[PDB]
């Protein structure tokens, strides 16, 4: 399984480490769920210590906010336009934080400011 | 380690295994006390060297040293009531001057000799081992019993031991 330990990395001197123990559950890892544009579908993950994480797979509606007018109403997500990390995320329309997306201000360019893979929903503000 | 209970040794063999001067000087003491083997010579020697170490170590420090007041006095205090050191000698230097005849003289085989029960030191072995001898309120079958100063007027015969 995916692990997040430094035992498999290299030292600052380039010296490859040597394995003393096998993989441990305390350093688990899980595959990303690239939240695309589609019908609302959220899977709740059973994390460590029994806590529950909301993993969003496909969302369309986000509770965007406006800071200059102090209004927070939901709006439908149109498409992913700009991403600061990977332009290939635009084609897949992956919903991640910082992804510049465009919306139509029917109840009112938005930047997602949440973690749909952890919180399970999309929220942002107005550029 | 293996066992939680502690153990220790009591005698160490001499470094030089053969000396013509160390056999007569032992038989002069073995024959004086009528012992069984040569262990008790070393066992008494080991005990004397044990207490000689503390006095020698403590003597290196000044009088005002806190450990000299506490450990040094406690060494003499134990040495006093054991009968090894007479009461009038109350200095740390007198501990080194002690010899092996002092500790050997406090053995029960030597105390019963001076009380008037055994004519010969070899005869006293049967009396102690046979349980004829009672020290105050308890029967004793161990000849190497080193009595204390208070018990010196207290060794006497038992009352028809079984």
């Amino acid at each position: 399984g995916i692990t997040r330990d430094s035992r498999h990395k290299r030292r600052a001197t380039g010296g490859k480490k040597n394995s003393m123990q096998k993989k441990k559950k305390n350093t688990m890892g899980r595959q990303p769920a690239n939240t695309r544009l589609g019908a609302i579908r959220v899977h709740d993950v059973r994390c460590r210590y029994g806590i529950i994480k909301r993993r969003a797979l496909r969302l369309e509606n986000g509770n965007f906010s406006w800071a200059s007018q102090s209004i927070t109403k939901g709006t439908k997500i149109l498409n992913v336009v700009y991403n600061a990390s990977d332009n290939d995320f635009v084609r897949t329309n992956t919903l991640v934080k910082g992804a510049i997306i465009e919306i139509d201000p029917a109840p009112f360019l938005a930047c997602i400011s949440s973690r749909p893979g952890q919180t399970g929903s999309v929220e942002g503000y107005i550029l | 380690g293996r066992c939680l209970r502690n153990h220790s040794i009591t005698y160490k063999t001499p470094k030089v295994p053969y000396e013509r001067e160390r056999f007569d000087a032992e038989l002069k003491l073995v024959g004086q006390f009528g012992l069984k083997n040569k262990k008790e010579i070393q066992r008494v020697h080991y005990m004397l060297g044990h207490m000689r170490t503390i006095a020698k170590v403590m003597l290196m420090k000044d009088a005002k040293d806190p450990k000299r007041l506490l450990e040094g006095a406690a060494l003499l205090r134990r040495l006093h009531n054991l009968g090894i050191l007479p009461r009038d000698q109350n200095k740390l230097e007198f501990v080194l001057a002690l010899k092996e005849e002092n500790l050997l003289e406090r053995r029960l085989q030597t105390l019963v000799y001076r009380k008037g029960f055994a004519k010969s030191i070899h005869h006293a072995r049967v009396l102690i081992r046979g349980k004829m001898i009672k020290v105050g309120k308890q029967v004793v079958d161990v000849p190497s019993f080193l009595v204390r100063v208070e018990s010196e007027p207290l060794i006497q015969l038992a009352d028809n031991t079984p």
């Binding site: - | 029967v139 079958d141 079984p162």
Partner: protein, 56 residues
Amino acid sequence: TRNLIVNPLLCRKQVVVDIYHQTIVLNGFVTKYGGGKTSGFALIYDTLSALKKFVP
């Protein structure tokens, strides 16, 4: 003889016996070296009500 103390909560008394040669439970019966004097630890539970429940 020796020490006599009474338990105020367990309804029993703890005593130390010493030999000089149903309601009593005798444990620790050992003698000295070579025989003769023998000792032990007698426990008396008086009323059977406490004895029938304060016992392994």
